[PDB]
Design a binder for this molecule. Structure first.
Ligand SMILES: C=C1/C(=C\C=C2/CCC[C@]3(C)[C@@H]([C@H](C)CCCC(C)(C)O)CC[C@@H]23)C[C@@H](O)C[C@@H]1O
Lengths: 11, 230
């Protein structure tokens, strides 16, 4: 899966 | 014996924690409200509290010295696998022996005593360690940067980052935590990290069960579904 939200929060 | 670099690491983690843990709960008013009386009446509120807290755990993690040197992929794997354990650790600060939560409340979010009894036992045992805030924030950081999480690629680097924090904690205990309080304290803190693995596993099992029903999955948040699984 992808983790676009987590990726965005990790900057 | 605490080096300048160790004092620096501790100051960075205290501030990181202060910047991501608001003990006034000023934000809780923006969650779906707790409902109290297969109801699951507390699932919306606790899902929003957990979703909020995952955001905070991520903010804390980004500030752990060394964490920035990992690849975005490894940062992801470490956060997904630790988020529930750091929520359990950080919640020890509100734990005490609308926004106080008891056993029935957690039951009303779709969980059972198989999770809740060991979770309360963990919170009591952690509270009894009476950790300094320095120790508490080091333990959360050590929990996040664990080299044995499944899917870690560059484990050597994660290990190296964690060793720096473990060494800081061990030295802090020796230098700043007076006996008797300090007796076996590091090993006891590591045992809590082991206890958290077992809690993580049982939470995962109950989460998969409650979220398997689309009507319950509907009540979660997009971030919770992404981090804990969908
Ligand atoms: C969150 C925080 C807090 C409490 C944590 C609790 C008490 C209620 C039950 C919770 C939320 C446990 C539940 C098993 C989590 C269930 C989540 C879900 C329904 C998605 O499977 C884990 C930690 C527990 C309050 C404050 O300390 C901030 C912290 O950050």
């Amino acid at each position: 899966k992808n983790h676009p939200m987590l990726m965005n929060l990790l900057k | 014996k605490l080096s300048e670099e160790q004092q620096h690491i501790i100051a960075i983690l205290l501030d990181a924690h202060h910047k991501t843990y608001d003990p006034t709960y000023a934000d809780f008013r923006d969650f779906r409200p707790p409902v109290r009386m297969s109801p699951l009446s507390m699932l919306p509120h606790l899902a929003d509290l957990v979703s909020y807290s995952i955001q905070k755990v991520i903010g804390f993690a980004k500030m752990i010295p060394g964490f920035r040197d990992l690849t975005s992929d490894d940062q992801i794997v470490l956060l997904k696998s630790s988020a529930i354990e750091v929520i359990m650790l950080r919640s020890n600060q509100s734990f005490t022996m609308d926004y106080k939560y008891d056993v029935t409340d957690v039951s009303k979010a779709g969980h059972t005593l198989e999770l809740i009894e060991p979770l309360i036992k963990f919170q009591v045992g952690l509270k009894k360690l009476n950790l300094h805030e320095e120790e508490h924030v080091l333990l959360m950081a050590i929990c996040i940067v664990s080299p044995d999480r499944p899917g870690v690629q560059d484990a050597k680097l994660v290990e190296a980052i964690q060793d720096r924090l473990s060494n800081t904690l061990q030295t802090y205990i020796r230098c700043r935590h007076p006996p008797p309080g300090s007796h076996q304290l590091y090993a006891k803190m590591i045992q809590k990290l082991a206890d958290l693995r077992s809690l993580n596993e049982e939470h995962s099992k109950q989460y998969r069960s409650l979220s398997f029903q689309p009507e319950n999955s509907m009540k979660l948040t997009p971030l919770v579904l992404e981090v804990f699984g969908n």
